Structure 1
Amino acid sequence: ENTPLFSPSLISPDVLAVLPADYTIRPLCRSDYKRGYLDVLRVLTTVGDINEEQWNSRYEWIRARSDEYYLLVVCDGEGRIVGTGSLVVERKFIHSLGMVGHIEDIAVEKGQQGKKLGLRIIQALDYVAEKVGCYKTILDCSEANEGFYIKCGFKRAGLEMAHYY
């Protein structure tokens, strides 16, 4: 219930060292449902209404795949979740059975934006990806937040194409 999703050993010590006083970054755990986690994702897009049972079910699905789904949180001095980020590690046959890190669902509470918390989330996710043996990390962004990813040391590599249902 407070068991971290993945090893705290995968949290970048350099990131931990430069966070603001009393803020932390750490793996998700199941009790994060009760520390404002889904409210943070509302800055991204529609989350929907998810009750605790549905959370517990998806959480255990993700925990059964914790060599694939690396979800971490930023907490303020009061233990409130104020930022989220995901790394999803894709297995391939190409690149000698290579692994690609996919950065997803990056979100910082509006009142907490513009203090480098997104940068720290990206640095932490890039640390995980390198540690577990990804050959690269990629993500999709908008023209409007490309400048954020540039300041995180990402470069334009191609186009995102979509098909909706």
Structure 2
Amino acid sequence: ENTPLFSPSLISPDVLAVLPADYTIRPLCRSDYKRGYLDVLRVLTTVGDINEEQWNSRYEWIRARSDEYYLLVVCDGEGRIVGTGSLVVERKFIHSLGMVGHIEDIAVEKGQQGKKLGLRIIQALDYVAEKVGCYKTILDCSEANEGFYIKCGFKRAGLEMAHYY
């Protein structure tokens, strides 16, 4: 229930050293369903009603693929989930069978925004991608939050195109 999704060694030690007092950054675990996880995602976009059985099934799917999916959380110093982020590591043939990190689903509870938590999430996901051998990490963002990603040391690389069904 409390077993981390992936090795705690994958959490950047430099990030751990600089996080605000009593805050924690750590891998997701199954029991995080009970600690406000999905409510944090609600700042990003819509989530829907997800029951515990459905959570458990999707969590186990992800856990079976813990060398592709890295989901982590930031907890306040009450252990409440206040921030989320994901890295998905894609395998390619190009770049001598290279791997690309994709940062996804970055969210910080409104009341906890503007305290460097999002920066620490991005730094932590960047650390994972580099450590496992990715040649780059990419993500898509809006014009309104490009400046956040600039401050995280990302640069504009292209355009996101979409087709919604």
Does the TM-score normalized on the shorter chain lie above 0.5? Answer: yes
Question: Aligned-residue CA RMSD in angstroms?
Answer: 0.3
SS in 2 for 1:114: coil
Secondary structure at 1:149 match in 2:
helix
Inter-partner Cα distance in structure 1 for 2:115 and 2:2:
27
Q: Distance in 1 between matches of 2:48 and 2:127?
A: 31
TM-superposed CA distance for 1:82, in Å, is 0.1
Secondary structure in 2 matching 1:88:
strand
| Runs (5+) with no aligned partner, structure 2 | none
CA distance in 1, matches of 2:6, 2:96: 25
- Alpha-carbon distance between aligned partners in 2 of 1:107 and 1:30, rounded to the nearest angstrom: 19
Q: How far apart, in 2, do the equivalents of 1:141 and 1:52 lie?
A: 30
Residue of structure 2 equivalent to 1:49: 49
> Structure 1 segments of 4 or more deviating over 2 A?
none
Identity of aligned residues (%): 100
SS in 2 for 1:32: helix
C-alpha displacement of 1:112: 0.1
Q: Secondary structure at the match of 1:44?
A: coil
Deviations 1:118-157, CA, capped at 9 Å, x for gaps: 0000000000000000000000000000000000000000
Query: In the alignment, does 2:156 pair up with 1:152?
Result: no
Q: How far apart in 2 are the matches of 1:148 and 1:164?
A: 26
1:164, distance to aligned residue in structure 2 (A): 1.0
Q: CA deviation at 1:45?
A: 0.4
Number of matched pairs:
165
CA distance in 2 between counterparts of 1:148 and 1:14 reads: 20
Structure 1: unaligned runs, 5 residues or longer: none
Deviations 1:72-131 (A, max 9, x none): 000000010000000000000110110000000000000000000000000000000000
Question: What is the CA–CA distance in structure 1 between the aligned matches of 2:28 and 2:164, rounded to whole Å?
Answer: 30
Normalised TM-score (structure 2):
1.00
